[PDB]
Amino acid sequence: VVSIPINNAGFEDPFIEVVDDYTVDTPPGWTTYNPNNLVPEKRTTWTSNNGVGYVGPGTQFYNQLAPEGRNIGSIYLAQKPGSGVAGFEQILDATLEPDTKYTLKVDVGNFGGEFQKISLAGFPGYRVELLAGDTVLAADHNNLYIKDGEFKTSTVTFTATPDNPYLDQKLGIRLINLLQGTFSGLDFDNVRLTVEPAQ
Amino acid sequence: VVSIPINNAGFEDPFIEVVDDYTVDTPPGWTTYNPNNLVPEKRTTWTSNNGVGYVGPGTQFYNQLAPEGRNIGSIYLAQKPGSGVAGFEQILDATLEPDTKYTLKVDVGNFGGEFQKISLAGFPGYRVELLAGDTVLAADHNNLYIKDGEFKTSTVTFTATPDNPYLDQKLGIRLINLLQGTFSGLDFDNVRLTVEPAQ
Ligand SMILES: [Ca+2]
Ligand SMILES: [Ca+2]
Ligand SMILES: [Ca+2]
Ligand SMILES: [Ca+2]
Numbered sequence: 505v506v507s508i509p510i511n512n513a514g515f516e517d518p519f520i521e522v523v524d525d526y527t528v529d530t531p532p533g534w535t536t537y538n539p540n541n542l543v544p545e546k547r548t549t550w551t552s553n554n555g556v557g558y559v560g561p562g563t564q565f566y567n568q569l570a571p572e573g574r575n576i577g578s579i580y581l582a583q584k585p586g587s588g589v590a591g592f593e594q595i596l597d598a599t600l601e602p603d604t605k606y607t608l609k610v611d612v613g614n615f616g617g618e619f620q621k622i623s624l625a626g627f628p629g630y631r632v633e634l635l636a637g638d639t640v641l642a643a644d645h646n647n648l649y650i651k652d653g654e655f656k657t658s659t660v661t662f663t664a665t666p667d668n669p670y671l672d673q674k675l676g677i678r679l680i681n682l683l684q685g686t687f688s689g690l691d692f693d694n695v696r697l698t699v700e701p702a703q
Numbered sequence: 704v705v706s707i708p709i710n711n712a713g714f715e716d717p718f719i720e721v722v723d724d725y726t727v728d729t730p731p732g733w734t735t736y737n738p739n740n741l742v743p744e745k746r747t748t749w750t751s752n753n754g755v756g757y758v759g760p761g762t763q764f765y766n767q768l769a770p771e772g773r774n775i776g777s778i779y780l781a782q783k784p785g786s787g788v789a790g791f792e793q794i795l796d797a798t799l800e801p802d803t804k805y806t807l808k809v810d811v812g813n814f815g816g817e818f819q820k821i822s823l824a825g826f827p828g829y830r831v832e833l834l835a836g837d838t839v840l841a842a843d844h845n846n847l848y849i850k851d852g853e854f855k856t857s858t859v860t861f862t863a864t865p866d867n868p869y870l871d872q873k874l875g876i877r878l879i880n881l882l883q884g885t886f887s888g889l890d891f892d893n894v895r896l897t898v899e900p901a902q
Contacts, residue, residue, distance in 0.1 A: 585868050586838070605848070626866050633844075639785070639883060643844035645832075649804070649862035649902060663848035667825050669784050669884055684838060685868055703848060 540588025739787025
């Protein structure tokens with residue numbers, strides 16, 4: 505079992521000093537997945553946005569600390585449920601290889617609390633995707649039940665055979681806000697991708 | 704734990720007498736999910752199609768018999784990988800209810816063998832979806848590795864909270880050929896949907 509390197513896999517860049525502080529710009533090492541043009545190029549607190557946030561002692565958002573390190577990665581969509589999806593994408597340098605089983609793990613957070621008198625209860629749903637090239641090889645579309653204030657680990661697996669059409673294409677990861685409920689924000693942390701011989 | 708009734712949930716209708724025989728028309732109780740217009744209204748052996756097939760002693764397709772009963776449900780797509788998706792859909796009379804955990808199970812088959820000198824080795828990928836109204840609540844996009852000649856059970860879970868936007872909409876099930884590999888056909892059997900109080 506070997507790890508595949510991922511840039512800023514725990515959203516630890518940038519460092520954030522103050523409890524419950526956050527950014528509203530795409531985290532370093534990631535791009536914004538924006539198939540429905542829901543997230544604007546220039547973001548502020550109340551536009552749809554993504555960014556990083558510090559989860560440490562003092563936090564109103566969780567009954568635990570960040571799954572890894574200090575920070576999580578966050579995606580907020582202000583449009584009504586049903587309007588589309590958005591999130592994080594990263595294309596890796598590793599390529600799809602035959603007779604290999606890929607295991608993608610990421611922690612998904614349903615933050616609770618209240619922000620400027622707006623309840624953060626509720627959840628939009630999530631999807632975690634493993635890609636080769638432009639193809640979604642395997643995905644967890646919203647299978648875990650995550651209560652307000654907790655994280656759960658999503659696991660996505662895929663086995664590439666020697667006849668897979670997408671061998672030698674670049675691997676990729678997407679972490680998606682489904683916008684299928686309110687409050688329509690969620691967090692991700694601790695992205696891990698490992699490889700092993702196929703079963 | 705209570706079962707939700709599904710029509711023709713094991714594809715046992717119509718009865719098929721002869722080993723490895725099949726139909727090419729939408730199974731009773733189901734509709735054809737056809738978002739990319741890949742499946743024609745009138746089907747024959749070599750068009751894209753769906754239907755039912757008998758898997759019994761004598762079969763070339765599996766190292767086991769049908770997971771349930773005599774028959775499976777099958778979807779073949781003749782277009783090149785990447786062209787889109789198609790499969791089975793059924794809208795149920797049950798509606799989405801709050802504080803309830805849904806468990807959707809279906810057996811997914813990767814048939815092997817050879818048909819008219821064409822190898823059936825390889826697999827297109829699958830997705831199993833649980834719906835309310837037009838919304839995919841939860842889905843297993845291709846997480847199981849299924850070798851030629853075997854079936855594996857896919858499990859999809861979803862918990863509906865009292866604030867879910869889709870409460871009171873009709874539940875639905877989709878069983879999808881992803882068309883992400885060749886030979887681009889697969890089978891499904893033994894659709895089961897159960898309900899229980901939320902965790
Ligand atoms: Ca982290
Ligand atoms: Ca929440
Ligand atoms: Ca059956
Ligand atoms: Ca096959």
